[PDB]
Structure 1
Amino acid sequence: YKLICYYTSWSQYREGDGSCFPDAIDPFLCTHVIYSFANISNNEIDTWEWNDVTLYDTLNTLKNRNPNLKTLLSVGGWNFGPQRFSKIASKTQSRRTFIKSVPPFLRTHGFDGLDLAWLYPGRRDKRHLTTLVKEMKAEFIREAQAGTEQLLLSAAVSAGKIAIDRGYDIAQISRHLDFISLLTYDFHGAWRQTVGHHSPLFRGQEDASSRFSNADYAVSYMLRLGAPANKLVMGIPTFGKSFTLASSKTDVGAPVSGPGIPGQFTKEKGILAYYEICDFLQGATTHRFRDQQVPYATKGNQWVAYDDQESVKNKARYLKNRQLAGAMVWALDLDDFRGTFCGQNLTFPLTSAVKDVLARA
């Protein structure tokens, strides 16, 4: 089984214990670690943070302790305008230029592959995405002729039905990608008057309008579109989404007035790292959606939808029963990486729980 873990560049700037550098990553924890967000300048892949070359080096040294560890660099991300990806891919000259610049860059900094994070191709981009994936892979095959181990190619793909039908030709890109990470944790998100969980595993006999917004549906749909199971990777979040209640109501459908207040360390409205949630729980009321199989918590006028060891182990048993290639975890830096916030002096509790299940069978 594969355990793909993302590390984000900007996590280095969080204060105090929130600060996270690649050197805090357990070499034997994941099978693949993806460094988050390289940019594109002059139509060529390029660094993002002023100290990326130093962190690339710090990350790739983990391979000295664990020889089998693979690393990849992800291009794009949320702060990268989709429009920008759209312009690169649309013109063969710009696309070829970007493609030809990747292997050398990757080889220089010691990466084993490229992860594409075009966060949301539109109806007009579908055809160019296919082209980009095909040509990129073809270039990686040619490059391997030089006697060095072929570069890996992966992509982070939306798990939203409408999004999938709009910009992805799954049957086509699946045959060129080594693996596909399903972003099965964005099924709700401060943008509609109510409270709801963003990463439910199951539909939940309760509501019906959105029978599509759960991991189970996303997975079945991909398999139906032609994506081989042995190439699918289910995303498991290590963070939570917070809301500010509009009333004293906490149950399903409770009104919302906006995202929850920022965490002491992540300082981003609507989000909380697992380690900030562990602190949040003291004095909070905990609950669990039976049907969706995920928990949530409330305190004062704050409502949090998150994942704990049990929900995460559950999602992992599930991907196993469906024979998928493995799991993807978004943000090692959002997990209790120091292991000093969540009681048990265990480092990376959420990620470890996933790893344990994957190792049982």
Structure 2
Amino acid sequence: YKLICYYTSWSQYREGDGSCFPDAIDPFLCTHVIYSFANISNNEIDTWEWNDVTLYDTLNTLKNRNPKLKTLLSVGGWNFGPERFSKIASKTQSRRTFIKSVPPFLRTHGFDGLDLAWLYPGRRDKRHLTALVKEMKAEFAREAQAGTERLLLSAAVSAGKIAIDRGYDIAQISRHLDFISLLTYDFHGAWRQTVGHHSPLFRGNSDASSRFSNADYAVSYMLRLGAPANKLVMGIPTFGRSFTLASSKTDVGAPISGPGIPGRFTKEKGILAYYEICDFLHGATTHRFRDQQVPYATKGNQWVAYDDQESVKNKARYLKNRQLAGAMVWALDLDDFRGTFCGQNLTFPLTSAVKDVLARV
């Protein structure tokens, strides 16, 4: 089984214990570690943070301890505009320029592959996404002739049905990608005023609409569209999504006034790192959706939908039972990487719980 783990560039800037450097990563925890995110300047792959070359170097030294470890650099991300990806992929000339700049960059910094995070391709983009993937793969095969191990090519894909039908030719890109990470955790649309879980495993027998918004449907659908199970990787969040309640009602369908207040270290309305959630739990009321199989908590006017060791182990067993290629974790820096916030003196409790399940066959 594969254990794909993301590390974010900006996590280095968090205060105190929140600060996380590649250096804090257990070399034997994951099979693949993806650095997020690379940028695109003058139609060429480029660094993002001022100290990326230094951090790139720090992350890739981990392979001195675990020779089997594979690293990839991810391009795109949610802060990188989709229009930019769209513009580059639409013109064969700007697309070929981008493609050619990649292998040399990956080789200079010691990466074993490239991860595509175009979020997201629209109706007019579908055909070009396919061309981009296909041509990028062809360049990697051509570059391997130089005698060095062929670079890997992956992509992070939306788990929402409408998004899938709109911009992806799954059957086509599946044959060129080494693996596909399903983003099965942004299911509760940032649009409306209700409380809900962002990463439920199952539908939840007490609802009619949006049967599409849960990991199980997304996986089944991808398999139905043509994606082979041995190339599919299921995303498991290491963060939670918070809400500020508009009333004293704390259960399903309860009214929402907006995102939950920022975390002390994460400082971003709407989300909390798992290590922040562990602190938040003290004095909170914990509940669990039996049907969906995921937990949530409340304290004051704050409502949090998250994943714990149990929900995460549960998702890992599901993935195995369906014979998928493995799991993807977003993100190492949001897990209790120091092992000092969540009780158990265990480092990376969430990612470890997944690994343990994956290891038992």
- Could you tell me the TM-score, scaled by structure 1's length? 1.00
Query: Matched residue of 1:339: which SS?
Result: coil
User: Do 1:184 and 1:234's aligned partners in 2 also have CA atoms closer than 8 Å?
Assistant: yes
* CA–CA separation in structure 1 for the residues paired with 2:210 and 2:189: 14
Show CA shifts across 1:107-138 (max 9, x none). 00000000000010000000000000000000
Equivalent position of 2:69 in the other structure:
69
Question: What residue in structure 1 maps to residue 328 of structure 2?
Answer: 328
Superposed displacement of residue 72, structure 1: 0.1
Aligned residue in 2 for 1:120: 120
Q: Structure 1, residues 218-254: CA drift from partner, whole Å, max 9, x if none?
A: 0000000000000000000000000000000001000
The structure-2 alpha-carbon separation of the partners of 1:137 and 1:173, relative to structure 1 and needing over 3 Å to count, comes to same
Residue aligned with 2:313, SS? helix
Deviations 1:184-213 (A, max 9, x none): 001004421100000000000011111000
Q: Provide the rounded CA distance (Å) in 1 between the counterparts of 2:149 and 2:86.
A: 30
Give yes or no for contact 1:189–1:241 (8 Å, CA) kept in 2: no
Superposed CA offset, 1:147-180 (max 9, x none):
0000000000000000000000000000000000
Q: Secondary structure at the match of 2:207?
A: coil
- 3-state DSSP of counterpart to 1:241: strand
What secondary structure, in the 3-state scheme, does the structure 1 residue paired with 2:39 have? strand
Q: Does the CA-based 8 Å contact 1:190-1:270 persist in structure 2?
A: no
Structure 2 Cα separation of the partners of residues 186 and 77 of structure 1: 14
Q: Indicate if the aligned counterparts of 1:190 and 1:243 stay in contact, CA closer than 8 A.
A: no
1-side partners of 2:189 and 2:273: how far apart?
15
Q: Distance in 2 between matches of 1:190 and 1:74?
A: 24
Return the alpha-carbon distance in structure 1 between the equivalents of residues 144 and 108 of structure 2. 15
| CA offset digits 1:246-292 (Å, max 9, x no partner) | 00000100000000000000000000000000000000000000000
Distance 1:246 1:102 in 2: 48
Q: How many residues get paired?
A: 361
Q: Distance in 1 between matches of 2:90 and 2:132?
A: 9
The secondary structure found in structure 2 opposite 1:50 is: coil
Mapping 1:17-166, distance limit 5 Å? 17-166=17-166
Deviations 1:287-342, CA, capped at 9 Å, x for gaps = 00000000000000000000000000000000000000000000100000000000
Per-residue CA distance 1:20-68 (angstroms, 9 max, x = gap): 0000000000000000010000000000000000000000000000000
Secondary structure of 1:352 counterpart: helix
Tell me the equivalent position of 1:10: 10
Greater alpha carbon shift after TM alignment, 182-191 vs 314-323: 182-191
Which residue does the alignment assign to 2:193? 193
The 2-side partners of 1:207 and 1:16 are apart by: 43
Structure 1: runs of 5 or more not aligned: none
What is the distance in 1 between the residues matched to 2:236 and 2:214? 12
- 2:49 aligned counterpart, secondary structure: coil
Query: 1 CA distance for matches of 2:23 and 2:192?
Result: 39
Separation (CA, whole Å) in 2 of partners of 1:206 and 1:51 = 49
- Given that 1:263 and 1:276 are in contact with CA atoms closer than 8 Å, whether structure 2 keeps it comes out as yes
Alpha-carbon separation, structure 2, partners of 1:241 and 1:206: 21
Cα RMSD after superposing both structures: 0.4
The answer to whether the 8 Å contact 1:242/1:271 transfers is yes
- How far apart are the structure 1 equivalents of 2:265 and 2:68? 33
Q: How does 1:188-227 map to 2 (within 5 A)?
A: 188-227=188-227
TM-score by length of 2: 1.00
Any idea what SS the aligned residue of 2:171 has?
helix
SS of equivalent to 2:111:
coil
Q: Matched residues, percent identical?
A: 97
**Hey, what's the Cα distance between the residues in 1 that align with 2:79 and 2:318?**
32
User: Structure 1 residues 186-195 or 51-60, which shifts more?
Assistant: 186-195
> SS at 1:303's partner residue?
strand
Distance, in Å, in 1 between the alignment partners of 2:343 and 2:141 is 48
Q: Distance in 1 between matches of 2:208 and 2:141?
A: 46
CA contact (8 A) 1:117 1:155 kept: yes
Gaps in structure 2 of 5+ consecutive residues: none
List structure 1 segments (4+ residues) > 6 angstroms apart after TM superposition: none
Do residues 279 (structure 1) and 279 (structure 2) align? yes
The whole-number CA distance in structure 1 between the counterparts of 2:45 and 2:326 is 28
Give, in whole Å, the separation in 1 of the partners of 2:35 and 2:315.
24
- What SS does the aligned partner of 1:86 have? helix
